[PDB]
Structure formats: C-alpha cells, structure tokens
Amino acid sequence: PALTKSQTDRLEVLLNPKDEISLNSGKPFRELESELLSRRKKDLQQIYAEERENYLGKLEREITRFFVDRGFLEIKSPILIPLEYIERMGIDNLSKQIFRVDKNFCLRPMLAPNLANYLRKLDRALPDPIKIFEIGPCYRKESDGKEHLEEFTMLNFCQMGSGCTRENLESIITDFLNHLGIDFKIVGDSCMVFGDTLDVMHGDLELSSAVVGPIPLDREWGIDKPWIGAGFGLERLLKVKHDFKNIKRAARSGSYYNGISTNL
Amino acid sequence: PALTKSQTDRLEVLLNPKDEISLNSGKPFRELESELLSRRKKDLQQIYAEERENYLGKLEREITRFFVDRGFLEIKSPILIPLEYIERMGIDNLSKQIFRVDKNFCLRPMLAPNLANYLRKLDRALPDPIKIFEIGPCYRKESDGKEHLEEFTMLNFCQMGSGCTRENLESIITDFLNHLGIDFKIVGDSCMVFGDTLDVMHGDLELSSAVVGPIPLDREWGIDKPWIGAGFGLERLLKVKHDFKNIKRAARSGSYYNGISTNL
Ligand SMILES: Nc1ncnc2c1ncn2[C@@H]1O[C@H](COP(=O)(O)OP(=O)(O)OP(=O)(O)O)[C@@H](O)[C@H]1O
Ligand SMILES: Nc1ncnc2c1ncn2[C@@H]1O[C@H](COP(=O)(O)OP(=O)(O)OP(=O)(O)O)[C@@H](O)[C@H]1O
Ligand SMILES: [N-]=[N+]=Nc1cccc(COC(=O)NCCCC[C@H](N)C(=O)O)c1
Ligand SMILES: [N-]=[N+]=Nc1cccc(COC(=O)NCCCC[C@H](N)C(=O)O)c1
Ligand SMILES: [K+]
Ligand SMILES: [K+]
Ligand SMILES: [Mg+2]
Ligand SMILES: [Mg+2]
Ligand SMILES: [Mg+2]
Ligand SMILES: [Mg+2]
Ligand SMILES: [Mg+2]
Ligand SMILES: [Mg+2]
Numbered sequence: 001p002a003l004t005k006s007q008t009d010r011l012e013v014l015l016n017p018k019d020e021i022s023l024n025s026g027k028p029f030r031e032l033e034s035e036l037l038s039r040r041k042k043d044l045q046q047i048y049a050e051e052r053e054n055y056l057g058k059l060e061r062e063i064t065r066f067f068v069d070r071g072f073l074e075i076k077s078p079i080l081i082p083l084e085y086i087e088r089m090g091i092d093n094l095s096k097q098i099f100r101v102d103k104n105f106c107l108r109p110m111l112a113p114n115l116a117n118y119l120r121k122l123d124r125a126l127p128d129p130i131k132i133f134e135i136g137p138c139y140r141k142e143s144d145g146k147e148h149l150e151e152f153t154m155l156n157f158c159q160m161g162s163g164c165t166r167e168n169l170e171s172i173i174t175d176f177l178n179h180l181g182i183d184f185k186i187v188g189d190s191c192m193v194f195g196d197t198l199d200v201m202h203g204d205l206e207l208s209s210a211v212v213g214p215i216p217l218d219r220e221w222g223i224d225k226p227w228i229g230a231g232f233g234l235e236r237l238l239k240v241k242h243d244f245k246n247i248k249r250a251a252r253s254g255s256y257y258n259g260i261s262t263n264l
Numbered sequence: 265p266a267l268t269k270s271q272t273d274r275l276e277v278l279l280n281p282k283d284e285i286s287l288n289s290g291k292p293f294r295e296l297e298s299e300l301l302s303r304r305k306k307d308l309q310q311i312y313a314e315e316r317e318n319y320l321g322k323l324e325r326e327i328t329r330f331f332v333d334r335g336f337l338e339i340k341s342p343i344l345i346p347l348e349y350i351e352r353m354g355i356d357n358l359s360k361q362i363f364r365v366d367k368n369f370c371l372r373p374m375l376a377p378n379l380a381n382y383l384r385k386l387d388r389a390l391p392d393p394i395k396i397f398e399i400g401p402c403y404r405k406e407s408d409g410k411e412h413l414e415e416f417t418m419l420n421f422c423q424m425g426s427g428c429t430r431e432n433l434e435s436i437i438t439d440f441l442n443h444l445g446i447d448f449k450i451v452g453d454s455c456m457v458f459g460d461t462l463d464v465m466h467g468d469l470e471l472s473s474a475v476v477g478p479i480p481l482d483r484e485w486g487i488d489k490p491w492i493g494a495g496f497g498l499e500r501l502l503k504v505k506h507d508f509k510n511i512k513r514a515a516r517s518g519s520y521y522n523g524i525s526t527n528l
Pocket of ligand 1: 110140142147148149150152153154206207208209231232233234235236
C-alpha cells in the first residue's frame with residue numbers, strides 16, 4: 001500500500017538525520033510511525049536526563065566565550081528599533097522584508113546599525129582597536145524555504161581602527177569556523193547595503209556575509225575609521241552541524257526541541 | 265553658581281552608585297562633568313581589558329546553569345507570537361500594553377503561553393515531573409518610570425505533575441534568590457490572568473509573580489495536571505544587585521554598557 005502526502009509529511013517530521021529508514025519500503029504507515037515515535041521519545045528522554053541545554057542557547061554561549069576570550073566586548077542591544085534606521089542603512093523603499101511595529105518602529109533585520117552606533121560611541125573611550133560582537137534575534141519576512149526563517153538568530157562581530165584588513169577578517173572567520181568544526185570557502189558577492197561582500201559558503205549554503213570597510217554608508221553613521229565585520233546565522237550553523245534537512249529544526253519553535261519533534 | 269536641569273541630568277547620567285559626589289556643592293559643572301567622565305572612561309576601559317561580558321548576557325548564563333543543574337529543560341521559544349494568544353490568556357480587551365506586529369501577530373508580553381504549550385507537549389514524552397524554563401525578551405507598552413522597560417528580559421521556570429505545591433515553589437524561589445544573594449519576602453497579590461499570586465518583593469520592588477495551579481485558564485491551554493511557575497525580570501534583578509537608581513541602566517540599550525553611560 002502507498003503512503004499519502006499527509007502520511008509522508010508526518011514521518012518526515014519524526015525522522016532524524018541519523019536514521020536510515022525507507023519510508024516507501026511497503027511497511028505500513030502505522031509501523032513506521034510507531035518506530036519513529038519510539039526513537040524520538042527515547043531521544044527526548046535522554047536529553048532531559050543528561051544534557052538539558054537548548055541547541056541555540058548552547059551555541060550562543062559557546063560563540064560568546066570564543067569572542068570574549070579573543071578581546072571582543074559582548075553587546076546586547078535593542079531588538080525593537082527605530083524604523084528610521086532602515087532608510088538610513090540604504091535599504092531603499094529587502095525593504096518589503098521588514099516587520100513594522102506601531103508606526104515608527106520595526107523589528108531589527110540585522111545587528112549592524114546598533115553595532116555601528118556602539119563602535120562610534122566606544123571609540124571615544126576605549127583604546128584602539130575597538131572589538132565588539134552581538135548575538136541575538138533578527139527578523140525578516142521571507143518566502144518559505146529550507147534555509148530561511150522569519151525569526152532567526154544573528155552573530156555579528158566587528159572591529160574598528162587598526163587591524164581592519166581583509167586578511168585579518170579572513171583569519172578571524174577561519175579561527176571561528178575551525179573552532180566549530182565547519183568547513184567553508186570564501187566567494188565574492190554583493191549586496192544593496194554594504195556593496196561587495198566576502199560570503200562564507202558551506203557548499204551552496206551561505207553562512208555569512210562579511211565586509212571590509214570603509215564604505216560610503218559610514219558617513220551617515222559617524223564611522224570615520226577602517227573597520228571589518230561579519231554576520232552569521234546561528235540556525236544555519238546548527239543546520240550544518242546536525243545535518244538537518246530544513247532549517248526549521250534549528251529555530252525557536254514550539255514544534256521541535258533540539259531537532260526532535262515535540263508532536264509525540 | 266547653580267546647576268540647570270539639563271546640567272543635573274547630564275551629571276546623573278555619568279554618576280554611578282559607588283560614587284559619593286555632591287552635585288550641588290558649588291563646584292562648577294565643568295569640573296563635576298570632567299571628574300565623572302574620567303571615572304566612567306576608567307570603568308569602561310577596565311571592563312574592556314578584564315571582563316568583557318554583558319551584565320544581561322552573563323546573568324542569563326548564570327541563571328541557565330542554575331536551572332539546568334536542577335533538572336529543568338532550557339527552552340528558547342518564539343518572541344513574535346500569534347495575537348490570538350492574548351485573548352486566550354484572559355487578557356480582556358494590559359491589553360493596551362501589547363505591541364502589535366502586522367495584523368495577526370504581536371511581541372510576547374510574557375513567556376507563559378509558550379511554556380504552557382511546551383508543558384502540554386512534553387508531558388506526552390517525558391517522565392513526571394516536567395520541569396522547564398525560559399529566559400528571553402518580552403515587550404509591554406509602559407508609562408515611563410524607574411522600574412519598567414518596554415523591552416525587558418523575563419525568566420520563567422515552571423513544573424507540572426508531582427511536586428507542584430506552594431512549599432516546593434517557595435523553596436525553589438528561595439534557593440534561586442539565595443544563589444544570587446538577593447534578600448526578599450513573599451506577599452500575596454492578584455492579577456487578571458492568573459488570579460492569586462505569590463509576589464516576591466525586595467522592599468517595594470516586585471521581583472516576581474509566582475502561581476500555584478491549577479487555575480481555570482488551564483483548560484483553554486490543555487493543561488490538566490498540577491503545576492507551579494514563576495516569572496522574574498532580569499533587569500530588576502540587576503537593579504537590585506548593582507543598586508541602580510533607574511532600571512534603564514540595566515536594559516538593552518545603546519545608552520549604557522553594564523550601567524556605564526556610553527555618551528563619553
Ligand atoms: N531569513 C533568514 N533565516 C536564517 N538565517 C538568515 C536569514 N537571513 C540571513 N540569515 C543569516 O544571516 C547572515 C547575514 O545576513 P545577510 O543579510 O548576509 O543574509 P542574506 O545575504 O540575505 O542571506 P540569503 O541570501 O541566504 O537570503 C546570512 O549569511 C545568514 O547566515
Ligand atoms: N515593563 C517591565 N519592565 C521590567 N520588568 C518587568 C516589566 N513587567 C514585568 N516585569 C518583570 O516580570 C515579572 C513578571 O511579570 P508580571 O506580569 O508579574 O509583572 P507585573 O505584575 O505587571 O509587574 P508590575 O506590577 O511591576 O508592573 C515582574 O515581577 C517583573 O520582575
Ligand atoms: N551601516 N553602517 N555602517 C557600519 C559601519 C561600520 C561598522 C558597522 C558594523 O556592522 C557590521 O558589521 N557590518 C558588517 C555586517 C555584514 C552582515 C550584514 N547582516 C549584511 O546584510 O551583509 C556598520
Ligand atoms: N496560560 N496558562 N496556563 C498555564 C498553565 C500551566 C503552566 C503555565 C506556565 O507558565 C507559567 O508559569 N505561569 C506562571 C507565570 C507567572 C508570571 C506571569 N508573567 C504573570 O503575568 O503573573 C501556564
Ligand atoms: K534520515
Ligand atoms: K552615587
Ligand atoms: Mg536574504
Ligand atoms: Mg545572500
Ligand atoms: Mg549575505
Ligand atoms: Mg505591569
Ligand atoms: Mg504587579
Ligand atoms: Mg506581577
């Protein structure tokens with residue numbers, strides 16, 4: 001007997017990368033579902049007995065330790081930001097991807113503008129070079145797909161002053177991804193806000209866009225020194241690490257816990 | 265010569281609890297400002313040289329370790345939630361405090377509804393009792409004041425099944441606040457959503473509202489067992505720990521870093 005689309009979808013929710021099970025072997029849906037339900041209950045029970053840490057939270061903590069230990073200041077800045085930042089970032093009326101709140105605010109679609117303000121302010125007090133980073137939620141309206149979430153988690157690290165060269169940026173990216181065990185290559189790309197980017201690719205998956213300043217946008221943000229920076233999506237990092245087929249397994253969700261369905 | 269309101273406000277931005285300086289001693293504004301600017305630059309330089317951790321991030325990490333080590337599962341759930349959750353929580357049309365996003369979403373004003381969904385789902389897979397917690401951003405429109413932020417950080421821990429008594433709830437609260445070194449008392453209060461609460465007070469400052477279920481709301485969320493839970497604001501905890509006069513010193517902000525003005 002054949003499986004319906006609804007039945008296949010249910011089994012795909014319960015399947016995990018480490019399994020090797022044929023969904024269309026001819027084994028009935030009831031036995032495939034029962035087997036996968038038992039494997040997933042066992043997996044969740046083991047997490048609850050022995051680890052208890054959320055993958056996104058744990059990865060944020062691991063990344064925070066890496067950057068703090070390398071001299072970067074840990075920032076936590078507003079998620080709800082002025083809508084005026086959008087136009088001022090050169091997102092001309094991507095603009096359609098912004099979640100608006102009330103009439104003068106929005107959910108930040110990236111960390112960059114708040115970090116640019118911190119670089120400018122901290123350069124009045126701290127010695128050269130200024131090194132900061134932030135990890136937290138960002139928001140974009142997206143077409144459904146395997147590598148995009150509307151609510152995702154960004155890391156952005158950046159530096160301003162001395163040492164803001166392409167080679168130092170590539171070296172930090174290399175140390176960072178070597179620390180996480182993730183293979184990558186760097187390919188050129190370009191974007192509306194920053195211009196030319198160094199995109200960090202794991203196969204066809206974009207893990208990061210990175211930028212070597214200065215750029216013309218700097219003047220509108222009061223940035224007047226060389227700078228480098230890069231933005232990474234944490235759920236994309238987890239998708240690679242855990243071989244997830246869909247990024248939703250990695251997301252803030254009520255539907256998956258550490259990639260295990262919560263519909264059991 | 266006397267200080268203007270603008271001058272006093274500037275000195276108050278630069279003043280920290282550990283200082284003992286008379287603003288209206290007759291010393292001129294220029295010398296008070298220069299002295300406080302030097303103290304704050306020194307403070308920020310010491311943070312950058314020797315700690316580099318953000319107070320909110322560090323406190324989240326400390327609280328996470330406490331609860332994980334006591335058997336609670338770490339949750340990270342959506343911040344952008346369905347607007348339908350508001351009515352379903354008994355926030356009758358507090359309702360005016362909700363930030364709406366688009367037409368069917370809002371920013372969560374509390375963690376409770378997402379945690380109720382997790383308790384219900386996890387009770388199908390995990391052994392009794394179910395113990396979970398979450399730390400993250402919550403949002404409410406507020407009248408300006410010394411103890412409220414529009415963007416704040418909540419901890420909520422909760423348990424469902426056995427052990428869901430007032431005495432066990434009070435014992436967890438006591439262990440938690442003893443771990444942070446914060447004195448408190450418990451006073452009864454009541455709220456629209458949950459009914460009677462045990463409010464955890466540090467002087468006149470409400471650190472938490474806690475609840476012993478069951479309550480009538482349970483049926484609308486599929487909760488059908490005893491439960492306990494409590495919600496704490498992290499910025500209020502930091503206000504107590506650091507003796508800040510205004511909670512804004514503790515907030516996600518571009519204006520203060522670990523309670524030090526970034527306008528230097
Ligand atoms: N909607 C999203 N969901 C998950 N991660 C995202 C999303 N948008 C961006 N990111 C992550 O943030 C990083 C920095 O953002 P950037 O603006 O460069 O993304 P992007 O170039 O729009 O990505 P893409 O081309 O895949 O849409 C990306 O390299 C990616 O890892
Ligand atoms: N606007 C806010 N800013 C900062 N912390 C808050 C805010 N609202 C609530 N909290 C924190 O979250 C906890 C749980 O939320 P709860 O709904 O009980 O607050 P509340 O009773 O409305 O607080 P209050 O009476 O002070 O407005 C509070 O005890 C407090 O520590
Ligand atoms: N705007 N502006 N001017 C500045 C000036 C100086 C530094 C910063 C710091 O922030 C950054 O690091 N920018 C690089 C981020 C690259 C990732 C990004 N999400 C992207 O959409 O490609 C901003
Ligand atoms: N809704 N509903 N039903 C349930 C049923 C079971 C458990 C939960 C779990 O969530 C909770 O812990 N509730 C207690 C939170 C108290 C703090 C809160 N911010 C307040 O406004 O007073 C919710
Ligand atoms: K598989
Ligand atoms: K003082
Ligand atoms: Mg994109
Ligand atoms: Mg791209
Ligand atoms: Mg990109
Ligand atoms: Mg209130
Ligand atoms: Mg109250
Ligand atoms: Mg309360």
